[PDB]
Amino acid sequence: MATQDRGERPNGFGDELERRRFVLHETRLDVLHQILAQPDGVLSVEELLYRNPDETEANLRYHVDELVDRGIVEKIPVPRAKSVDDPPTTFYAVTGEGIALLRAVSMYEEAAVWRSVYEQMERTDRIEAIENLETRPDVDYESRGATA
Amino acid sequence: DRGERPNGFGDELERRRFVLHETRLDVLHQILAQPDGVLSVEELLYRNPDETEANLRYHVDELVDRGIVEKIPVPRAKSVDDPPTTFYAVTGEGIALLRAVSMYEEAAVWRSVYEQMERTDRIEAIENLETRPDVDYESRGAT
Ligand SMILES: [Cl-]
Ligand SMILES: [Cl-]
Ligand SMILES: [Cl-]
Ligand SMILES: [Cl-]
Ligand SMILES: [Cl-]
């Protein structure tokens, strides 16, 4: 987006501001930072529920669905893992555009701060099983502008 | 052990959402664009003729209350009729907040835009008032 058009704000300016205000929401940033802090950068809804035990599934889905609709989060369907009852078959990753948006509001580097907190978090057998599923997608974050 | 943020976090998000507002960003960019870095309400009304004075003043007052803009009283100039006696400047904290939302760098383009703004003689006279305070955004931006 240009800075100006004929000395005025460019046409999509107000919509860009709305997009930036949208991402500046504590539960949405919790989701985005949790995803980014995970070593392979993907999480299922079941895993997000575990990390956010004060929120309802309905509320978490509402924020994830909104994030996907806006192109900030990518919905990745995956096969059924053979080893596990009722495994997650959808995982979520942050997109290149989402990383760009987080950088624009100075909320991207904040994710790294939380890696060791989630690495050390106490896990149930079920969460350990999900974190080790063979069907977790492999996302190339380097190509999405992530810091290495 | 699953991540608690402080309450300070929610308040910082709210501060960032507050500044991501087109009229407020227009005010801030207009102030930063001015070569001496200060503007009167008369000068802001001139630049934002589609806004009501009450609404423009609302935005300025909200920016001052949050410490993003500084209100600076000055003496009454002898040289012009009914001169402004309050000028507004962006604060150090306001610069830090604009940088946090990626809105500070573009101030150089706005300077260039506003250099080309058509001026009335009244606005010219106000721009040359001896009572205009002096602010240095290089110093405020570094501290
Ligand atoms: Cl431009
Ligand atoms: Cl799930
Ligand atoms: Cl960042
Ligand atoms: Cl005035
Ligand atoms: Cl900036």
Q: What is the DSSP letter of A93?
A: E
CATH of the structural domain B1-143, one choice from 3.10.129.10, 3.20.20.70, 1.10.10.10, 3.90.1150.10: 1.10.10.10
The position carrying tokens 């100039």 is B77
Nearest to B1 among A17, A29, A121 (CB): A121
Q: Which residues of A67-103 are buried (b: 16+ CB within 10 A; e: fewer)?
A: beeeebbbeeebeebeeeeebbeebbbbbebbbebbe
Cβ of A3 and B109 within 8 Å? yes
CA B47, CA B42: separation in Å to the nearest integer? 9
Report the SS3 class of residue B71. strand
Cβ of B101 and A20 within 8 Å? yes
The first and second tokens of residue B22, run together, are 């087109």
Resolution in A: 1.8
**Domain assignments of chain A as residue spans, ordered by start:** 2-148
CA of B44 to the centre of ligand 4 (A): 8
CA of B129 to the centre of ligand 4 (A): 13
Using an 8 Å Cβ cutoff, are B28 and B63 in contact?
Answer: yes
CA B94, CA B68: separation in Å to the nearest integer? 4
Residue numbers of A between 4 and 43 with CB closer than 8 Å to B = 4, 7, 9, 13-14, 17, 20-21, 24-26, 29-30, 34
Amino acid letter, A9: R
For residue B69, the cross-strand partners are: B90
Using an 8 Å Cβ cutoff, are B1 and A53 in contact?
Answer: no
CA B71, CA B111: separation in Å to the nearest integer? 21
Range A2-148 classified under CATH 3.30.110.30:
no
- Judging by beta carbons within 10 Å of its beta carbon (0-12, 13-18, 19+), is residue B14 exposed, middle or buried? exposed
Amino acid letter, B72: I
Distances (CA, A) of B120 to A144, B123, B125, B127, B133: 50, 5, 9, 11, 21
Residues of chain B neighbouring A117 (CB-CB closer than 8 A): 1-3
- Judging by beta carbons within 10 Å of its beta carbon (0-12, 13-18, 19+), is residue A129 exposed, middle or buried? middle
Rama region for A128: left / alpha / beta (φ>0; ψ in -120 to 50; rest)? alpha
Using an 8 Å Cβ cutoff, are B98 and B28 in contact?
Answer: yes
The first and second tokens of residue B9, run together, are 């976090």
- Number of helices and strands in chain B (H, E): 8, 2
